[PDB]
Amino acid sequence: RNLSRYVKWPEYVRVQRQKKILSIRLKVPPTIAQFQYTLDRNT
Amino acid sequence: APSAKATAAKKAVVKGTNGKKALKVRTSATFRLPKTLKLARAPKYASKAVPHYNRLDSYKVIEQPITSET
């Protein structure tokens, strides 16, 4: 069995992954979050 | 319809086909420090630049013969 979800990761790794999770899950003002209505690619 | 072909194409044009991940097997519960490069010293200067000489040469070791009767 591969147990990649079960491992004890390092600390800063835990911080940054949880941080991105948190910034996802948080309600946001409209001032920021005009960011990530950001530009597409070919342009 | 689902238009699965065309929404795949949508995802293609909007992300640019760089859309999968190389999933790594990770089996150890604990992750450890990677074994990395470890040099040895190249001093620009020596520590004292002169070796001290033989501290403990023989003429200094042997102080004396005893001259007693036993």
Characteristic key phrases:
part of a larger assembly; 2 chains; A: 43 residues; mainly alpha; 1 helix; elongated; B: 70 residues; 2 helices; 0% strand; rod-shaped; ribosome; pre-60S; Biogenesis; LSU
Question: How would you describe this protein?
Answer:
Chain A: This is Large ribosomal subunit protein eL8A. Chain A: It is found in: Cytoplasm. Chain A: Belongs to the eukaryotic ribosomal protein eL8 family. Chain B: This is Large ribosomal subunit protein uL23. The structure is cut from a larger assembly and holds chains A (43 residues) and B (70 residues). Chain A is built from 1 helix and no strands. With 43 residues, chain A is mainly α. In chain A, 35% of the residues lie in helices and 0% in strands. Chain B has 70 residues and is mainly α. Chain B is 23% helix and 0% strand. Chain B is built from 2 helices and no strands. The A-B interface holds A 1-4, 6-10, 40-42 and B 13-16, 23-31.
